Ligand binder design. Structure first.
Ligand SMILES: *C/C=C(C)/C=C/C=C(C)/C=C/C1=C(C)CCCC1(C)C
Ligand SMILES: *C/C=C(C)/C=C/C=C(C)/C=C/C1=C(C)CCCC1(C)C
Lengths: 246, 246
């Protein structure tokens, strides 16, 4: 199995160092966030979504530090394209949970809706089409990324509706400011993901594997750790509001 | 890109013919079921889950007839293992929808529960771990299939609870017989999927690609088309019951 496209070049040895440093920072932040979440579950009210997302993020960060360019992290393919399977597998593991957190922003509604199902189905579909585009090479790559773009447009529309509903269901004041911050983080990072797909080796190679890893680590820290911590803060605020007035 | 494991042998030219015949039958059944579902939506009450699952099944069947051993259907991998990405992508597209149908067996509850989220998260996780095991080769394959086994055990437990709840929420008589039939189909086919994974090239090679395709086509016709048609019949019975007594 020679396939000279498998060697290519992973980075510039500076993007590699930046990726390693960002992986260490992401692992440290995930460890600290998991410790804080455990402390909360022991003392305060904490949701399962933030803990699960942070745990998967920590596992993915460790696996990307150690075996990023190995199998179940990098499929090498007869087409000469190295597919970062770890990235898309972690997306499939976390993004549905992130959207289950987006629905029920205030951790009180034990019920859900058909809009949550639409969100989840569209998100799984867009991740599937993006992974297929990453493995696709050629016009099939363009077709599958356009399919993922349509599914992600549906996902973004449903997420925006969920964010408006959450903004209008939280108490007036700090709670809706936190909802606005969560919406900003969500949309900026989730829109940067397809941009990095386009700029990465999976699309037009502009970023290289290590530069794409740097950018994806930044927007994962934004969309998984920071967004989850903001959601936990929102739920803490909701609990305190219920204790005082509710 | 030579990697002599990519050639191997797809089948015995009899398993190939059986696979082609079963793909034609599955495509015909999916087309007829989609026509019937469109007729129902125009006249009767029909759910989106059955239509979506049947449409994805039809698309997957056509893509497996035409490009099964091509890219976005077969990742060839530097490890020499041909990964049927089409299979796992279709699982990711359909199984969450099949479980969204399993929750809300009677298409009346516009709300959902945290058990539905547990079902969906466990199902996505088990599909992810199974795909990773298929791409994994070696002891990593065993580890990831055991992780998928744990996630699928959680999925099966939640599905059994959902089936008991559905059995006890449908009217006594034909409705619960249909629920029992759906449970039998669901558990038999969904348990045959890991068995075929073990028996297929992705595990212990016993079945070959074409024999695995034959078995997977049979259990997809069981779990996607037949189960969805049974769910549609259950919802029709619920609607008629509400019209008479409800
Ligand atoms: C922690 C990881 C997250 C939140 C990943 C989110 C991923 C997306 C919003 C994916 C978007 C894509 C498209 C809309 C089109 C191009 C392909 C994708 C998969 C990158
Ligand atoms: C239409 C396709 C369906 C319903 C597929 C269902 C898939 C499963 C129940 C998957 C099961 C797996 C495990 C429990 C362990 C071994 C790996 C898998 C992914 C085959």
């Amino acid at each position: 199995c020679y396939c000279a496209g498998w060697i290519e070049s992973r980075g510039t040895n500076g993007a590699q160092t930046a990726s390693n440093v960002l992986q260490w920072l992401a692992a440290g932040f995930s460890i600290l966030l998991l410790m804080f979440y455990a402390y909360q579950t022991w003392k305060s009210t904490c949701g399962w979504e933030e803990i699960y997302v942070c745990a998967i993020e920590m596992v993915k960060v460790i696996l990307e530090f150690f075996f990023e360019f190995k199998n179940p992290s990098m499929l090498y393919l007869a087409t000469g394209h190295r597919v970062q399977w770890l990235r898309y597998a972690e997306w499939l593991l976390t993004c549905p949970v992130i959207l289950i957190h987006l629905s029920n922003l205030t951790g009180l509604s034990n019920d859900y809706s058909r809009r949550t199902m639409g969100l989840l189905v569209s998100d799984i579909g867009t991740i599937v089409w993006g992974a297929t585009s990453a493995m696709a090479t050629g016009y099939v790559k363009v077709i599958f990324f356009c399919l993922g773009l349509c599914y992600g447009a549906n996902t973004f529309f449903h997420a925006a509706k969920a964010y408006i509903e959450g903004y209008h269901t939280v108490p007036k004041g700090r709670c809706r400011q936190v909802v606005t911050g969560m919406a900003w983080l969500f949309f900026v990072s989730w829109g940067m993901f397809p941009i990095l797909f386009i700029l990465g080796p999976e699309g037009f190679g502009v970023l290289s594997v290590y530069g794409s890893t740097v950018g994806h680590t930044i927007i994962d820290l934004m969309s998984k750790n920071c967004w989850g911590l903001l959601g936990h803060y929102l739920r803490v605020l909701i609990h305190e509001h219920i204790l005082i007035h509710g």
